[PDB]
Amino acid sequence: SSRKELANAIRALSMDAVQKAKSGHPGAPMGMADIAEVLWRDFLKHNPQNPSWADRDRFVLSNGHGSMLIYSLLHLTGYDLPMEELKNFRQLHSKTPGHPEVGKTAGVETTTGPLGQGIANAVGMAIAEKTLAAQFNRPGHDIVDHYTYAFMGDGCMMEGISHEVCSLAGTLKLGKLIAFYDDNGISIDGHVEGWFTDDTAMRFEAYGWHVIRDIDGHDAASIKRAVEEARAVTDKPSLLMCKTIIGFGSPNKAGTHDSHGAPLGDAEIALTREQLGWKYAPFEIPSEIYAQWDAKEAGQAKESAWNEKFAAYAKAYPQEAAEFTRRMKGEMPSDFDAKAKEFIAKLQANPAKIASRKASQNAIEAFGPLLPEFLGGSADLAPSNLTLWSGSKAINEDAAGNYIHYGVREFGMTAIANGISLHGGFLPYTSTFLMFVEYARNAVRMAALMKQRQVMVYTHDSIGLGEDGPTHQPVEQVASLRVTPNMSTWRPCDQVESAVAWKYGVERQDGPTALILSRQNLAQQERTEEQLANIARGGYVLKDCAGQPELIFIATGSEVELAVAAYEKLTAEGVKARVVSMPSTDAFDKQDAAYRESVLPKAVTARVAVEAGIADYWYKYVGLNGAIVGMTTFGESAPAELLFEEFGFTVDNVVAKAKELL
Amino acid sequence: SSRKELANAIRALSMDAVQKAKSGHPGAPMGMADIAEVLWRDFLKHNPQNPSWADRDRFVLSNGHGSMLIYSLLHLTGYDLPMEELKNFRQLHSKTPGHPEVGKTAGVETTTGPLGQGIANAVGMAIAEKTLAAQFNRPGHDIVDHYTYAFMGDGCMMEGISHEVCSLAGTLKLGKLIAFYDDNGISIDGHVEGWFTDDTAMRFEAYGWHVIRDIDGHDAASIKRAVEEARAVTDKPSLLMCKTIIGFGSPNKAGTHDSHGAPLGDAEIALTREQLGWKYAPFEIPSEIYAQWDAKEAGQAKESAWNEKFAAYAKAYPQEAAEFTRRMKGEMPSDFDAKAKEFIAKLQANPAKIASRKASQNAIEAFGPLLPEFLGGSADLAPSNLTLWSGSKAINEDAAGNYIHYGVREFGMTAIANGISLHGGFLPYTSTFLMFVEYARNAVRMAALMKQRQVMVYTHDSIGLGEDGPTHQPVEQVASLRVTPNMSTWRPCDQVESAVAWKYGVERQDGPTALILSRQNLAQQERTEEQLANIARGGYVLKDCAGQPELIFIATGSEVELAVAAYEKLTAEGVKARVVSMPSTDAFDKQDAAYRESVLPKAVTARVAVEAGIADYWYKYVGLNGAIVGMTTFGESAPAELLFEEFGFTVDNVVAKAKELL
């Protein structure tokens, strides 16, 4: 068959699956089918029977609303995605959800839908490939060598995150990142020139990318030659600007915004079939077309050849081969747990009153030699977030390094680290002040939705940062992380809880972990061995009375000290009080019921929560008959000690509130 | 005095004030003093005696950490900011907080600190001047004519929001926006070439800006000539790239990342005075330097001339003069309340089962003719968000219009609208799907912190949107808005509550209002005249029993219908139940104690909350002995009716949970 007929099979499946679901976006899949036919049949290195092959090329559909394009490609090339799933596009529990979801459908590399993040994830996959090749390849033993391809549309180019990630990709010279831009002149509001007039080619040359302009996106020969030129440029990422017609093939709706996001209609589909010359009924693909699209034979040959090369590598470099396999699987080193527990025990025995941001740097220093898979960075706040350790080597200086200077690009940083984690081989950690989790908020949600491991280090967590004032002092950000599904959030009260929280975050395989750290120094608390083990349960009894408590204080982070001092004052007056330290509400909520009742007994309703954060969160644990010493307003610019007094974080106010319940 | 000695006055005050506070950032203020001297003494049109003059030029310091730069300028030119406040920089309740704050210090036009948002607000100020001039100027009476100047640094340039708002500024041809870039080669991590290598001039030419490269930022004549040239380009915004030395004057710290954000030290300050030739003691400015910087005489002369122009304008165009005055004050038209009340009562009398996104478009259509100050827009979702009304005219087609096609730029859209609100003369509304409030989250927080009126229309509020799936279906976003100080959030259950929420939002002068709207149709509830009036109290009794209730349902938005059906089943079994509709928790919490107790009596603890959003928010109203029917996970891709069933939003499940409390 001609290349056009093969590309028309993508068009037929896309328009028919959107029509059957009566929902979805036919436009982009029909406008990009010729580009995808060239990319997938002539260049993409993959094996449909093993979507986990370590050295496969990575493809990312950043304009994720065109999901029928990737489902058509996966079906046609031989992945495990049967025609029956294409007929159940957008239906309950099918393997073809409205936007592609990683882990759910074989062959899908990331979850897209939120514009801009797929090209960010692809920059992260290209950094991972480059860095893993630099760390493991040996001359004649290049076991890491694969490209990262991305499709993106006008919506991704308008979003600010495309500027963050493509600017940094130009700095880091990612020659194996090749992006195809669907330049079709249309967005949801209509013709884009009323709101989008950039000279995009000139903008990308300003980032140091190689750019190929004016590619006829409906001519296979033109597309093929552009891909060949881009693959020969090895020191700059490439942008291929492909001029396409949205909804290509539809006599009445091609080139209009009406083909973007609704079914074409049965009558228009009949006309489109005739204009394309596509003679097959819905969901019918002839044998001859499958034979030209299937990639099972070539896929097995390419992976077979790589397995022979990896076996030769393991005979000369056995230790490196075992590390490569452990890291690609995301397995922890077998001695890690033991060494981390010894370090934690040592800190409990040698108290230090230091900020938890410094305790965090001390844990990175202790774990660094044990976890070569670290790939960490900070958004231009290394000296304040304290993310460098003695072994950090920045990858703009040494390609085989383990640290990234991300620049002032929080959202791009977090979504790039999600691409690092999806690639395999690394354990990324990212960092900025806690307020600026608001710049990166949806990339944090996307790590939790895609169940990816990433440690997020957020320092300067409250009015305790002082003079910078209310634009930087967090109030309500912690509560927003705590109610995000699948997010783990730790607010440690001293250097020991900080080390426990870092251990929990590196061992968490199915989701991210945010550490909420202080700028100011925190006193260490004394613990028995039983209490030291309970820190990982998220909430635990830190101070107790003989007999049952009449009053319970619940505190976190820097406010644990205040609740211990109030406990000391009330116990001296004969009150039976208890202090519960709650570094993580999500780890506590997961404990068995008898554990949670032994910490927070249901019969004790006189409960006081103490935290320099928005008060309304704490009704979950104190109920309507308790009291909350928290913030209800924005902060103020002044020295931290004065702010804690101004906002009621004093021993006298805590005791007074507790006494009102007695 | 030479220009350099006048600029050194800024340098001395800035390093000495940082030194006294022992906190703050001397680098940028020392680097940019010479540019500020030229701009403020030779070009800025302002009156220090009236910082609210409607036709003043607007100045924005986007690199807000250099706050002593603006406090020095306001003090020196004659604003009401005495030397004692400069001596109290960063101290509790001073008029010189660590980052500049609008509303607290005379002359400060916006609150900056979060990088990238200053330049976004400046773009909104320039949009507002252009649109207001087009609406009100008449031949021989140009009552609106002023520039918008912004200073920005490398941090602002790296942030994604600078691409969003500078790209749109180019499309809109904002000739009166002139930005100065502090090109000093340094950020907090060190020399920026490791992480920032853009050809910034070529990027801004790709946006359609006029760019002046390689300006010696320490040479007054070069700076003056570049401003003159930028002022003469009237159809493109200009970027002046000014090469400066960070910490200019300090022998040992100039040009290093050490001068960015820590005091220089007494010894260094002494050497800096010697290098600069600055002889005066700390906080000592000679009378002759004040005489050259004071702008009170010139400012009063220019405002006096504008006042006479406005009086002549009001004689020739009396209707337009009265509207200009009303809009600049932010007052409602005198018949708005009565007309809006009539529209609301009409809706209650003529029920319709429509989505609240459609009820929102219907309110825009009714209020549109009454509020010519609307300046609304959507982030490329006009046909889904339903933000156009019959009188919408986009400003890319007609400069006197009232609608902005923002493109796919949620964060730039929201911080531009903040700049439109700060300028005066308009009431902005912005819109996108609720999930993408996470892309613009810190701009939404800054609207609340600055106390600015903006209506934010967020549609597609829950798993009720259906097939687009978990990347798009909100779960925890409404709870994050509700715990933001000074944010108002409404989730109306039908077309009547929707109109009351829009009315509340346009009348709210001291903060923003978000409307949370459904994609799917909502049934209308019956109300007496008393219930109809209580909708604006945020929480009210919708259905009740005789005597004190034994069980109370609290529901919002699309779930009120489920709660009412559960009430009907339980009432038929003889339970005394009540249903409370709670469209706004923040308006309910502001009610007096007597009203809140009448709606939610403290003695009744059997309370059930029903809402398709994260469950943990609701402990605030249901306590520990109540139940919540909510979401605790991400959503799924499927038709809406099936998701409500799958996640437990059914009458039978709500009845079952309620019965467990009885």
Ligand SMILES: Cc1ncc(C[n+]2csc(CCOP(=O)(O)OP(=O)(O)O)c2C)c(N)n1
């Ligand atoms: C961050 C974000 N904002 C808004 C949307 C809603 N949305 C989906 S596609 C789209 C614009 C369509 O533009 P383009 O990328 O040009 O796609 P095309 O119509 O050409 O396929 C928008 C606004 C989204 N998915 N993500």
Ligand SMILES: Cc1ncc(C[n+]2csc(CCOP(=O)(O)OP(=O)(O)O)c2C)c(N)n1
């Ligand atoms: C959104 C955001 N992220 C991070 C910061 C913390 N921060 C303050 S200044 C700065 C970088 C300094 O760079 P530049 O703008 O070049 O300032 P200069 O040192 O040249 O004054 C950073 C990262 C911030 N204020 N806002």
Ligand SMILES: [Ca+2]
């Ligand atoms: Ca497009």
Ligand SMILES: [Ca+2]
């Ligand atoms: Ca700089």
